[PDB]
Design a protein around this ligand. Structure first.
Ligand code: NA
Lengths: 312, 308
């Protein structure tokens, strides 16, 4: 068949348009008592494998990979290591929805509430009767409100600096957010990101603000957004962490009450439903979204191929 | 869920998705007729396979078909995220290599039926594939074009299966880490030509731009802007055919003399030509390698089932 090649079984899915590659069998065996030590093992001793499935030509820039792992915790359903074409992640909301929907379609997870171990600790994910998944996000908060930043080529932009599991600069209403305009939106948000760094504008404790999000009105959602992610990429989904940061700002401005659902549309019209409860002076947001399968695949690595382990 | 069996491969870095079973049956007796049927009655399947999130913008699709002609090994319909192609050199290499790996083609010269006529491809005993390109020729030599923000650029206008502007020179450094600047420059050139109505013969839009530089191992390295502000990961079989045509016209390369072209990612094709009219018949040799054996899955509940 392809007996001279290395075979890796993956299940590709997308969460509201943002793709996840779940890796099931064939990947190097990892050692460690916890998911974090396994992630170190992957990084230190098996990184070529991350590169083979995430770099071109097998991977493409927007993909997140998710390696299925045995559970660490006694009450966890499984463990997972997330990664991309540049390195290893901690938590990954859209990837977790992908993981859960994937394992759902394989019968390994059934409706109800599941704990999932990650290198950054446990994540609670509820699989609903209808196949949707709600993931409870980390504590989220706003650091600063309506901070002006002069962006060469665009003048002065105001935005909130907030934390939702990543640092965001949120600019909420006159670019408008259509999918056919992503080049211009990327240029703009990129200019903002560069200006923040040039001008030493950070999150709490020096945190680099590496995500930029724009919000506008939407006919059938509370808002539509465009989200610049690290590496000049945009999120196809409404962005779980970005939407968590948005809710923190809404809460801090008294525009959204605990328990109240906010519906966030993405640049491509997919949607997340979100709500929060108060935790101290911050919020605990939950993000509900839906993933669908893309492929059940055997990745093939042919050692004769000059790009077997990925193009730089 | 709809299930579609694909073999993904790449040819010098440029990926091909070979569709094998699972698609609706296409009506027609010629590959041309089956392509029209695909386009008119089953286009959503092209989009499901090629648009995000299942496909990506550098991918070419190839639907395996029964051969129409007695001496052809098979038929193929090539397509991408915008529509349907006729011939596709790099996809033909991936097709042939894939069939070889499936045990369906053995080394030798093969004829493959496409909507734009037959393509001759030789599968060599070492697994390489030579594809014979359409007749290629230079239309104009050293045409000057004034590019807003970059100055005056010269290049040949040549046909290789697509219309190309081949840039005479530039101080751009053709390295993979510089694709953003190279795209900006070549896109500006492309827009400049179209604004000044600088075209191929018959008003043909020059939608590909090629830059060349020296290489330590190959005769040349290029960067190729393709439609969609995308770049070719391979040396570009049609752009290399166009280049040979220019070399041949300049008497810089003789019939049968091999030229080796490196790509922006350091992958390589070998090329040579024989004369045919006042143009050339080039052949392009490269290699394809497998990426995945996959079942694409289309869930009708998915708002993006048939692509974003
Ligand atoms: Na609204």
């Amino acid at each position: 068949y392809f007996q001279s090649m290395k075979r890796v079984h993956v299940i590709d899915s997308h969460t509201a348009g943002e793709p996840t590659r779940l890796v099931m069998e064939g990947m190097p065996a990892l050692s460690g008592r916890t998911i974090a030590e396994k992630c170190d093992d992957f990084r230190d001793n098996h990184d070529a494998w991350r590169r083979a499935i995430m770099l071109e030509p097998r991977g493409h820039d927007v993909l997140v990979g998710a390696l299925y792992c045995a559970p660490e915790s006694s009450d966890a359903s499984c463990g997972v290591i997330f990664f991309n074409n540049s390195g290893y992640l901690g938590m990954c909301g859209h990837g977790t929805i992908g993981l859960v929907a994937s394992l759902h379609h394989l019968g390994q997870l059934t409706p109800g509430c599941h704990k999932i171990d990650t290198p950054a600790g446990p994540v609670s994910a509820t699989l609903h009767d209808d196949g949707a998944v709600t993931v409870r996000n980390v504590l989220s908060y706003r650091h600063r409100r309506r901070v002006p930043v002069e962006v060469p080529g665009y003048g002065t932009v105001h935005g909130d600096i907030a934390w939702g599991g990543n640092w965001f600069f949120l600019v909420s209403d006159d670019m408008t957010l259509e999918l056919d305009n992503v080049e211009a939106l990327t240029d703009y948000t990129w200019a903002i990101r560069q200006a923040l760094e040039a001008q030493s504008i950070t999150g709490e404790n020096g945190g680099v603000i590496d995500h930029i999000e724009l919000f506008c009105d939407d006919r059938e959602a509370d808002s539509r957004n465009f989200v610049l992610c690290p590496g000049k990429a945009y999120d196809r989904s409404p962005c779980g962490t970005g939407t968590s940061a948005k809710l923190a700002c809404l809460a801090a401005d008294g525009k959204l009450a605990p328990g109240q659902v906010w519906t966030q549309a993405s640049i491509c019209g997919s949607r997340f439903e979100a709500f929060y409860e108060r935790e101290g002076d911050g919020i605990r947001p939950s993000i509900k979204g839906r993933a669908y399968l893309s492929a059940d695949a055997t990745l093939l690595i042919d050692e004769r191929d000059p790009f077997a382990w990925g193009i730089a």
